């Protein structure tokens, strides 16, 4: 419950980047629909938009110089396929998207 097999601190860090990319993917579409409007407020919306626009053309993948690019490419692929109702990382997202 505290070792590298579960790590509460690390578990929150991958969740936080994963969700920030999910926000920024559609927020980039929202922003471009009005050129460059400053209507948002997420602390890293701009950070993710820069990484996402880069990822959309980057071909270095596993050997890229952008620390967030290869990480983000792998992080998205987890949530794209996981369905386990007690997954430590997906649980807050599986709850964020529940009918309750």
């Amino acid at each position: 419950a505290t070792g590298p097999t579960a790590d509460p601190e690390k578990r929150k860090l991958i969740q936080q980047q994963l969700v920030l990319l999910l926000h920024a993917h559609k927020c980039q579409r929202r922003e471009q629909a009005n050129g460059e409007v400053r209507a948002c407020s997420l602390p890293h919306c701009r950070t993710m938009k820069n990484v996402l626009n880069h990822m959309t053309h980057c071909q270095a993948g596993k050997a890229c110089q952008v620390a967030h690019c290869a990480s983000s490419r792998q992080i998205i692929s987890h949530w794209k396929n996981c369905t386990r109702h007690d997954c430590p990382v997906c649980l807050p997202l599986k709850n964020a998207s529940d009918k309750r």
Binding site: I14, Q16, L22, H78, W79, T83, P88, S97
Partner: protein
């Protein structure tokens, strides 16, 4: 379980991600309020696409 539930088994495919860059996000997100409250399984296409990640094959 004596006061709070234990931390579940972190997915091994995400353990491989270096989390040092992510430390900037440690107190800057709302995991539960970002989501459009639609469905979890809907993530297959709502999240991103093959052109968005430069799919090699």
């Amino acid at each position: 379980g004596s006061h709070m539930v234990p931390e579940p088994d972190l997915p091994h495919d995400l353990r491989h991600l270096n989390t040092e860059p992510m430390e900037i996000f440690r107190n800057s997100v709302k995991i539960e309020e970002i989501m459009p409250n639609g469905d979890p399984l809907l993530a297959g296409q709502n999240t991103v696409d093959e052109v968005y990640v430069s799919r090699p094959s």
